[PDB]
Design an enzyme around this catalytic site. Structure first.
Site, PDB file in Angstrom:
ATOM      1  N   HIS A 180      46.772 -49.348 102.273  1.00 43.46           N
ATOM      2  CA  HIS A 180      48.073 -49.917 102.631  1.00 43.46           C
ATOM      3  C   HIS A 180      49.209 -49.259 101.855  1.00 43.46           C
ATOM      4  O   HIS A 180      50.385 -49.478 102.192  1.00 43.46           O
ATOM      5  CB  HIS A 180      48.044 -51.456 102.460  1.00 43.46           C
ATOM      6  CG  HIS A 180      48.218 -51.929 101.045  1.00 43.46           C
ATOM      7  ND1 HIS A 180      47.164 -52.371 100.278  1.00 43.46           N
ATOM      8  CD2 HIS A 180      49.334 -52.132 100.303  1.00 43.46           C
ATOM      9  CE1 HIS A 180      47.617 -52.756  99.096  1.00 43.46           C
ATOM     10  NE2 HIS A 180      48.933 -52.624  99.085  1.00 43.46           N
TER      11      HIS A 180
ATOM     12  N   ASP B 291      40.457 -51.240 102.730  1.00 44.50           N
ATOM     13  CA  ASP B 291      41.782 -50.917 102.206  1.00 44.50           C
ATOM     14  C   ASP B 291      41.705 -49.824 101.150  1.00 44.50           C
ATOM     15  O   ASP B 291      42.369 -49.896 100.104  1.00 44.50           O
ATOM     16  CB  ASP B 291      42.474 -52.146 101.629  1.00 44.50           C
ATOM     17  CG  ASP B 291      43.953 -51.926 101.413  1.00 44.50           C
ATOM     18  OD1 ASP B 291      44.487 -50.904 101.959  1.00 44.50           O
ATOM     19  OD2 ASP B 291      44.592 -52.752 100.695  1.00 44.50           O
TER      20      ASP B 291
ATOM     21  N   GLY C 201      53.387 -53.432  93.213  1.00 47.68           N
ATOM     22  CA  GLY C 201      53.375 -52.043  92.869  1.00 47.68           C
ATOM     23  C   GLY C 201      52.182 -51.616  92.047  1.00 47.68           C
ATOM     24  O   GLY C 201      52.110 -50.456  91.638  1.00 47.68           O
TER      25      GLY C 201
ATOM     26  N   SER D  16      48.857 -52.239  93.149  1.00 43.28           N
ATOM     27  CA  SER D  16      47.688 -51.918  93.962  1.00 43.28           C
ATOM     28  C   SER D  16      47.226 -50.493  93.671  1.00 43.28           C
ATOM     29  O   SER D  16      48.026 -49.612  93.352  1.00 43.28           O
ATOM     30  CB  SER D  16      47.990 -52.111  95.452  1.00 43.28           C
ATOM     31  OG  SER D  16      48.807 -51.095  95.974  1.00 43.28           O
TER      32      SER D  16
HETATM   33  C1  LIG Z   1      47.789 -50.965 106.863  1.00 45.20           C
HETATM   34  O1  LIG Z   1      46.392 -50.973 106.720  1.00 45.20           O
HETATM   35  C2  LIG Z   1      45.889 -51.952 105.888  1.00 45.20           C
HETATM   36  C3  LIG Z   1      44.380 -52.034 105.648  1.00 45.20           C
HETATM   37  C4  LIG Z   1      43.779 -53.091 104.752  1.00 45.20           C
HETATM   38  C5  LIG Z   1      44.759 -54.079 104.067  1.00 45.20           C
HETATM   39  N1  LIG Z   1      44.143 -55.068 103.198  1.00 45.20           N
HETATM   40  C6  LIG Z   1      45.053 -55.981 102.570  1.00 45.20           C
HETATM   41  C7  LIG Z   1      44.491 -57.067 101.653  1.00 45.20           C
HETATM   42  C8  LIG Z   1      46.564 -55.894 102.816  1.00 45.20           C
HETATM   43  O2  LIG Z   1      47.386 -56.776 102.141  1.00 45.20           O
HETATM   44  C9  LIG Z   1      48.744 -56.253 102.151  1.00 45.20           C
HETATM   45  C10 LIG Z   1      49.084 -55.386 101.198  1.00 45.20           C
HETATM   46  C11 LIG Z   1      48.774 -56.244  99.845  1.00 45.20           C
HETATM   47  C12 LIG Z   1      49.604 -56.110  98.618  1.00 45.20           C
HETATM   48  O3  LIG Z   1      50.734 -56.479  98.541  1.00 45.20           O
HETATM   49  N2  LIG Z   1      48.893 -55.491  97.542  1.00 45.20           N
HETATM   50  C13 LIG Z   1      49.410 -55.417  96.175  1.00 45.20           C
HETATM   51  C14 LIG Z   1      50.490 -54.426  95.822  1.00 45.20           C
HETATM   52  O4  LIG Z   1      50.978 -54.282  94.736  1.00 45.20           O
HETATM   53  N3  LIG Z   1      50.854 -53.555  96.887  1.00 45.20           N
HETATM   54  S1  LIG Z   1      51.997 -52.428  96.546  1.00 45.20           S
HETATM   55  O5  LIG Z   1      51.654 -51.431  95.521  1.00 45.20           O
HETATM   56  O6  LIG Z   1      53.249 -53.085  96.157  1.00 45.20           O
HETATM   57  C15 LIG Z   1      52.388 -51.631  98.119  1.00 45.20           C
HETATM   58  C16 LIG Z   1      52.790 -52.491  99.341  1.00 45.20           C
HETATM   59  C17 LIG Z   1      53.030 -50.256  97.950  1.00 45.20           C
HETATM   60  C18 LIG Z   1      51.555 -50.367  98.371  1.00 45.20           C
HETATM   61  C19 LIG Z   1      48.687 -55.832  94.880  1.00 45.20           C
HETATM   62  C20 LIG Z   1      49.744 -56.768  95.478  1.00 45.20           C
HETATM   63  C21 LIG Z   1      50.858 -57.265  94.552  1.00 45.20           C
HETATM   64  C22 LIG Z   1      51.664 -58.323  94.794  1.00 45.20           C
HETATM   65  C23 LIG Z   1      51.562 -59.185  96.072  1.00 45.20           C
HETATM   66  C24 LIG Z   1      52.882 -59.113  96.871  1.00 45.20           C
HETATM   67  C25 LIG Z   1      52.848 -60.149  98.038  1.00 45.20           C
HETATM   68  C26 LIG Z   1      51.769 -59.741  99.091  1.00 45.20           C
HETATM   69  C27 LIG Z   1      50.515 -60.658  98.924  1.00 45.20           C
HETATM   70  C28 LIG Z   1      49.354 -60.141  99.781  1.00 45.20           C
HETATM   71  N4  LIG Z   1      48.283 -61.067  99.640  1.00 45.20           N
HETATM   72  C29 LIG Z   1      47.265 -61.108 100.658  1.00 45.20           C
HETATM   73  O7  LIG Z   1      47.316 -60.447 101.662  1.00 45.20           O
HETATM   74  O8  LIG Z   1      46.202 -61.992 100.403  1.00 45.20           O
HETATM   75  C30 LIG Z   1      45.196 -61.867 101.381  1.00 45.20           C
HETATM   76  C31 LIG Z   1      43.931 -62.359 100.672  1.00 45.20           C
HETATM   77  C32 LIG Z   1      43.341 -61.522  99.510  1.00 45.20           C
HETATM   78  F1  LIG Z   1      42.194 -62.098  99.090  1.00 45.20           F
HETATM   79  F2  LIG Z   1      44.277 -61.531  98.506  1.00 45.20           F
HETATM   80  F3  LIG Z   1      43.087 -60.255  99.975  1.00 45.20           F
HETATM   81  C33 LIG Z   1      42.942 -63.198 101.495  1.00 45.20           C
HETATM   82  C34 LIG Z   1      43.876 -63.880 100.483  1.00 45.20           C
HETATM   83  C35 LIG Z   1      48.970 -58.752  99.256  1.00 45.20           C
HETATM   84  O9  LIG Z   1      48.629 -58.634  98.124  1.00 45.20           O
HETATM   85  N5  LIG Z   1      49.026 -57.594 100.143  1.00 45.20           N
HETATM   86  C36 LIG Z   1      49.434 -57.610 101.692  1.00 45.20           C
HETATM   87  N6  LIG Z   1      47.185 -54.904 103.651  1.00 45.20           N
HETATM   88  C37 LIG Z   1      46.264 -53.983 104.300  1.00 45.20           C
HETATM   89  C38 LIG Z   1      46.878 -52.922 105.223  1.00 45.20           C
END
Ligand SMILES: COc1ccc2nc(C)c(O[C@@H]3C[C@H]4C(=O)N[C@]5(C(=O)NS(=O)(=O)C6(C)CC6)C[C@H]5/C=C\CCCCC[C@H](NC(=O)OCC5(C(F)(F)F)CC5)C(=O)N4C3)nc2c1
Ligand SMILES: [Zn+2]
Length: 199
Positions: free
Chosen positions: A76, A100, A156, A158
């Site tokens: 993602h 992911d 940020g 992930s």
């Molecule tokens: C497109 O193709 C794909 C394929 C597989 C895939 N798989 C995922 C699980 C997914 O999720 C999305 C991205 C991730 C995230 O934000 N990732 C960070 C992060 O930091 N990203 S990042 O670096 O900012 C960025 C966006 C630059 C890259 C670590 C988070 C940090 C803070 C959260 C912010 C609010 C969001 C809370 C949300 N929660 C949640 O969805 O809970 C679900 C669930 C769980 F168990 F948690 F998985 C069942 C309950 C969350 O975390 N999301 C949403 N998108 C995809 C997309």
């Protein structure tokens, strides 16, 4: 189809989380201008060091972690993008949207974490701000923060590692579980899933 169609840029290493001393700290190695240019060319001549890299695209910034000679991150964040390197763009070696998960060969100069075989549930999450956050493992792919905090603090990060007490890699941070904006738990890609993907 068209002569106008654009190509997406490469992922670019813009810094690292320094874990070599007694104090974890973020270091920036490239500013936004050089990042933009390196994304277009795919040519990054900067020396890479360490295990946890800070990476960026034109639109997102996140982390990437070397484990067993592979630089891993989240789909993602990276999509199917190449990563910039001294000789040009490097195609992904692993892509798994269902996990992911993506991976490239680890950069020359990086250090790899060792996959954990401790079976410990006392973990530590490393964020892009070099916070080391205690996390109790709660399942195959989940852990609870011992000290909850707003999701802002995890955004940020992930692609960053969860580590065991001995500093081995246990997983790759994927998603945050939130209640009224407070992160109580995290989801991660377990290192065994990376070790399987590698086969
Ligand atoms: C497109 O193709 C794909 C394929 C597989 C895939 N798989 C995922 C699980 C997914 O999720 C999305 C991205 C991730 C995230 O934000 N990732 C960070 C992060 O930091 N990203 S990042 O670096 O900012 C960025 C966006 C630059 C890259 C670590 C988070 C940090 C803070 C959260 C912010 C609010 C969001 C809370 C949300 N929660 C949640 O969805 O809970 C679900 C669930 C769980 F168990 F948690 F998985 C069942 C309950 C969350 O975390 N999301 C949403 N998108 C995809 C997309
Ligand atoms: Zn271990």
């Amino acid at each position: 189809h068209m002569a106008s169609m654009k190509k997406k840029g490469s992922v670019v290493i813009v810094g690292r989380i320094n874990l070599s001393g007694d104090t974890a700290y973020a270091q920036q190695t490239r500013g936004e201008e050089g990042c933009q240019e390196t994304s277009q060319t795919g040519r990054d001549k900067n020396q890479v060091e360490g295990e946890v890299q800070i990476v960026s695209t034109a639109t997102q910034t996140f982390l990437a972690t070397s484990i067993n000679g592979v630089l891993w991150t989240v789909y993602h964040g990276a999509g199917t993008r190449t990563i910039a390197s001294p000789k040009g763009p490097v195609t992904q070696m692993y892509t798994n949207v269902d996990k992911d998960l993506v991976g490239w060969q680890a950069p020359q100069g990086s250090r790899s974490l060792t996959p954990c075989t401790c079976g410990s549930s006392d973990l530590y999450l490393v964020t892009r701000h070099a916070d080391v956050i205690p996390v109790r493992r709660r399942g195959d792919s989940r852990g609870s923060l011992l000290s909850p905090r707003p999701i802002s603090y995890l955004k940020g990060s992930s692609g960053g590692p969860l580590l065991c007490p001995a500093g081995h890699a246990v997983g790759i941070f994927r998603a945050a579980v939130s209640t009224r904006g407070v992160a109580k738990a995290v989801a991660f890609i377990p290192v065994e899933s990376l070790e399987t993907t590698m086969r």
